[PDB]
Enzyme design. Structure first.
Site, PDB file in Angstrom:
ATOM      1  CE1 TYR B  51     -15.607 -20.225   8.459  1.00  0.00           C
ATOM      2  CE2 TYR B  51     -15.317 -20.439  10.850  1.00  0.00           C
ATOM      3  CZ  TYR B  51     -15.791 -19.735   9.768  1.00  0.00           C
ATOM      4  OH  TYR B  51     -16.408 -18.525   9.970  1.00  0.00           O
ATOM      5  CG  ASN B  53     -13.555 -16.312   9.367  1.00  0.00           C
ATOM      6  OD1 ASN B  53     -14.375 -16.029   8.487  1.00  0.00           O
ATOM      7  ND2 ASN B  53     -13.886 -16.945  10.500  1.00  0.00           N
ATOM      8  NE  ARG B  97     -21.150 -14.963   2.836  1.00  0.00           N
ATOM      9  CZ  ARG B  97     -20.043 -15.628   3.164  1.00  0.00           C
ATOM     10  NH1 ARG B  97     -19.400 -16.388   2.306  1.00  0.00           N
ATOM     11  NH2 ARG B  97     -19.647 -15.576   4.383  1.00  0.00           N
ATOM     12  CG  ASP B  99     -21.618 -12.740   5.886  1.00  0.00           C
ATOM     13  OD1 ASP B  99     -22.103 -12.837   4.735  1.00  0.00           O
ATOM     14  OD2 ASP B  99     -20.966 -13.700   6.400  1.00  0.00           O
ATOM     15  CG  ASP B 130     -16.310 -16.722   4.325  1.00  0.00           C
ATOM     16  OD1 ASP B 130     -16.644 -17.099   3.186  1.00  0.00           O
ATOM     17  OD2 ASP B 130     -17.171 -16.677   5.193  1.00  0.00           O
TER      18      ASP B 130
HETATM   19  C1  LIG Z   1     -19.190 -16.775  12.210  1.00  0.00           C
HETATM   20  C2  LIG Z   1     -19.118 -15.937  10.934  1.00  0.00           C
HETATM   21  C3  LIG Z   1     -17.814 -15.159  10.742  1.00  0.00           C
HETATM   22  C4  LIG Z   1     -18.071 -13.837  10.052  1.00  0.00           C
HETATM   23  C5  LIG Z   1     -16.831 -12.947   9.891  1.00  0.00           C
HETATM   24  C6  LIG Z   1     -15.856 -13.002  11.059  1.00  0.00           C
HETATM   25  C7  LIG Z   1     -14.981 -11.793  11.193  1.00  0.00           C
HETATM   26  C8  LIG Z   1     -18.788 -14.013   8.713  1.00  0.00           C
HETATM   27  N1  LIG Z   1     -18.544 -15.016   7.835  1.00  0.00           N
HETATM   28  O1  LIG Z   1     -19.662 -13.202   8.476  1.00  0.00           O
END
Ligand SMILES: CCCC(CCC)C(N)=O
Ligand SMILES: CCCC(CCC)C(N)=O
Lengths: 145, 147
Positions: B51, B53, B97, B99, B130
């Site tokens: 995973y 970010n 998307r 969030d 992401d």
């Molecule tokens: C846990 C989800 C992480 C967040 C963005 C982090 C900066 C998301 N995918 O909305």
């Protein structure tokens, strides 16, 4: 450009499997032109372009002027597309763009996931997603700041 | 924490709906994110997984992933997820998307635009990345996640 651990090593990874994907990979090859007038010919009139950290451009003239501006400050030296896929009129590219800031001569390999909407083989939308701050810091160019 | 439908949203209905079994699980997973519950969410992942970010270092292996999610849910709540576009090819699912994220220290929220990619192996997540801009979120909610 180093191959990411997570990047497919499959022969068909990053290879176009549809006409729209083919156009998108031709467009990626054309990015290294640094030539907005060349690039704009891929776009429909009703179109948009956005580097997501920054405001969008709507309509073909705004898109062209945005690209011309970008190419005044940076060169796209190289693009490698690790993954491409598509569904329902949208193409997605997971890639690295090698960018060189003209004022400073410093380069950075920018990790990007981008989406392209095509209508009759022309780009109606192109949005690239990435982190701007890490690029700005690498090359000493406060694009947004 | 309203989410605005973008001017650029596809007018193809299939573009906004899950069209394969893997895409359906990804959308179930997006629904689950509002749980803010790393123990629950980790059941979606294979043992061999990763995973990231993209502004931040990757987590490799299910335990590292769970630990990262647990840390994230200590500082923020995912209040909503809307996926405008979803598609897939070559064993990868892509989601475009927003969030809606709320910082727990500050009470401030931000609508974060994200493009993400998922790899599923026998219905379990083996990769999730992401892509988004971190600075705009940090400044919006006064939480220097990276800084
Ligand atoms: C846990 C989800 C992480 C967040 C963005 C982090 C900066 C998301 N995918 O909305
Ligand atoms: C014109 C290309 C813009 C760059 C990112 C800007 C910071 C890219 N797509 O490589």
């Amino acid at each position: 450009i180093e191959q990411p651990r997570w990047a497919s090593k499959d022969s068909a990874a990053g290879a176009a499997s549809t006409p729209d994907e083919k156009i998108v990979l031709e467009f990626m090859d054309a990015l290294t032109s640094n030539d907005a007038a060349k690039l704009i010919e891929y776009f429909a009139e009703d179109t948009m372009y956005q580097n997501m950290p920054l405001p969008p451009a709507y309509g073909r003239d705004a898109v062209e002027q945005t690209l011309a501006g970008l190419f005044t400050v940076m060169s796209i030296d190289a693009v490698e597309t690790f993954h491409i896929g598509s569904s329902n009129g949208l193409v997605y590219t997971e890639r690295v763009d090698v960018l060189r800031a003209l004022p400073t001569g410093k380069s950075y390999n920018l990790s990007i996931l981008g989406v392209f909407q095509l209508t009759e083989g022309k780009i109606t939308g192109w949005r690239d997603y990435f982190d701007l701050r890490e690029f700005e810091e690498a090359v000493d160019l406060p694009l947004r700041g």
